[PDB]
């Protein structure tokens, strides 16, 4: 629930409280991406990437 991504920095913050409180964490461990619209996470039949 509620993954948020930076444009570059790999640190992402995640909340299971639906925004009531945020917690910062690693696990992107790369430059992530700068797509030209919005969407970053795009997924099908589980297998989110």
């Amino acid at each position: 629930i509620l993954y948020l991504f930076e444009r570059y920095q790999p640190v992402v913050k995640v909340s299971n409280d639906k925004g009531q409180t945020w917690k910062a964490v690693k696990l992107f461990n790369d430059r992530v991406g700068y797509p030209l619209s919005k969407t970053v996470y795009y997924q099908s039949a589980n297998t989110t990437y």
Binding site: E6, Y8, Q9, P10, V11, A24, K26, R31
Partner: protein, 75 residues
């Protein structure tokens, strides 16, 4: 076997992994570019010596032989 070894130090200043550290690997990259060279410093773990040859060589524990066929009379 690693029950047999003395204490030792590394032979230089190398960065080990601890939570008082005065050097901070950084949380994450202020890194606006793409290809300016970065590393992957691998996961801090036990630093492995000689795991290629773990069991290896076992030296001979004795002194040169006076050894000759010795027939000890029964009685």
């Amino acid at each position: 076997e690693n029950a047999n070894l003395p204490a030792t130090e590394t032979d230089e200043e190398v960065l080990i992994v601890d939570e008082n550290g005065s050097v901070i690997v950084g949380g994450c990259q202020y890194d606006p570019d793409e290809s300016g060279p970065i590393y992957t410093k691998y996961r801090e773990a036990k630093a492995s010596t000689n795991s290629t040859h773990t069991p290896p060589t076992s030296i001979t524990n004795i002194q040169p032989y006076i050894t000759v066929y010795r027939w000890i009379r029964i009685a």
